[PDB]
Design a protein around this ligand. Structure first.
Ligand SMILES: Nc1nc2c(c(=O)[nH]1)N=C(CNc1ccc(C(=O)O)cc1)CN2
Ligand SMILES: Nc1nc2c(c(=O)[nH]1)N=C(CNc1ccc(C(=O)O)cc1)CN2
Lengths: 265, 265
């Protein structure tokens, strides 16, 4: 069904056998022992609970200067990649920040502006030959047709990536749940996820604990585990390749049950 | 999408607005204060956590005499229906046991042998005018074609029900997960649930904590909450009207997230 593995330098990710789980690493503020030590323990924990990728990045949910984001995030990567044998993605949109992260040992790029923030990032991706996640986002919500416009917008990211030298096999798409979308639009995107498949790239889904779940269930962030469950289940059934979650133990067992049932693996 | 409500004597169940949750009531052995009091507290708890129906019945998972099953189950129904304002289904296949249960105040019949055990049950259903759940089951597993044979077998239950006087609107079907099916056949049934829809009746799904979940996840019964989650999510996405669960709080929030997303309600 995919005729290629996801190549991640040291590691290799097979897209046919199971839904791959990307664990969110909270960067609680760099350099200090407390910060880097708690991040390592948390990454070790996530590896133990069934995670396949560690996603390192903070400051999205402020506007910090770039030379600082590096001071924060570079030590984090050096440590985790040394002590947790697992691919690391860097969660930034900035070109200069991404460059450092791969240099410090990070394997995937995770751009929440899908190369539209700093088009030069896609050039960094092409050069180190890393896989890149292009997320749907935009500075507004004035959609003519939600799904039609997402697919259009995503394809504009691909165009920037490909004209930068990025190979098709190093491209992952993400519908960008929670970004430039009302609670009701987020549901529609979920309902229509299977459309992104026509584009012919692997899709990552990120819905973990987000507020649209709260809006439906009327429930604060620490009570959003079951809601997340449902979004991850519907996601996988709609053909997702990756899920980005906080609750690795739980989501990982759900993915596995989903895989058994849908006939994946 | 359904042009009719599910009529349950005192109560009425709408099939368009939400996935309806049936809570499993464990009958731990009748008459005694401890037994009936713990059953009532457990039913009150399930009502509090989002349940829409209470399912009362034990001895399926032995072979007890009929006049005893009544001594066990009749007091349970009198109590729960008095103190929990909710429809009760009786989980039996025996005609004489069902008769008593409705007489004691129970509203739905739940037959795990789909009128094939004691065809006379369907006559009890027709007479009191209660809804009946017909489950797929058989004394063997020698399937030519799993789904084709389920649908055939189910239709044999309907034939018995309808020739007994049961109205189409009082008929609910159930694929009978865990019954006369290997772990691998259970997955296939799950994968192909949407087929039962061609028959034109509401479908209840019962997979809560069952061993096929354990077989996939390699996990004992008390660790089967996420696995159950996935089965309930895929179920609802495949058009289920009811789910039969133990973990009402959790499953109830998942159903609700599923409903929001699939556009139900
Ligand atoms: N590839 C990828 N990266 C991310 C994603 C994401 O969904 N996909 N989400 C993130 C979290 N952003 C949020 C947006 C909305 C909400 C919410 O509405 O609660 C929470 C968090 C950041 N990084
Ligand atoms: N309408 C309906 N009634 C039931 C059902 C059910 O699935 N649907 N399951 C029940 C439980 N039977 C089990 C079968 C298999 C397993 C297992 O394999 O672990 C556990 C329990 C009894 N009553």
């Amino acid at each position: 069904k995919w005729d290629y593995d996801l190549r991640c330098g040291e590691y290799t990710l097979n897209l046919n056998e199971k839904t791959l789980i990307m664990g969110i690493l909270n960067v609680t503020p760099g350099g200090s022992y407390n910060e880097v030590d708690a991040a390592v323990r948390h990454a070790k924990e996530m590896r133990d609970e069934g995670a396949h990728i560690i996603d390192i990045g903070g400051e999205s949910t402020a506007k910090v200067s770039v030379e600082e984001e590096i001071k924060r995030v570079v030590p984090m990567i050096q440590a985790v990649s040394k002590e947790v044998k697992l691919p690391i993605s860097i969660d930034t949109y900035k070109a200069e920040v991404a460059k450092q992260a791969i240099e410090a040992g990070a394997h995937i790029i995770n751009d929440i502006w899908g190369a539209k923030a700093e088009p030069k990032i896609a050039e960094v991706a092409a050069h180190y030959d890393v896989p890149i996640i292009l997320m749907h986002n935009r500075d507004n919500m004035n959609y003519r047709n939600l799904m039609a416009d997402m697919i259009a917008d995503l394809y504009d990211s691909i165009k920037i990536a490909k004209d930068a030298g990025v190979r098709d096999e190093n491209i992952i798409l993400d519908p960008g749940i929670g970004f430039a979308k009302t609670p009701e639009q987020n549901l529609e995107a979920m309902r229509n996820l299977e459309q992104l498949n026509v584009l012919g790239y692997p899709v990552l889904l990120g819905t973990s604990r987000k507020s649209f779940i709260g809006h439906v269930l009327d429930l604060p962030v620490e009570e959003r585990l079951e809601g997340t469950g449902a979004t991850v289940c519907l996601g996988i059934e709609k053909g997702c390749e990756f899920v980005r979650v906080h609750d690795v133990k739980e989501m990982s067992r759900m993915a596995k049950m989903m895989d058994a049932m849908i006939g994946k693996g």
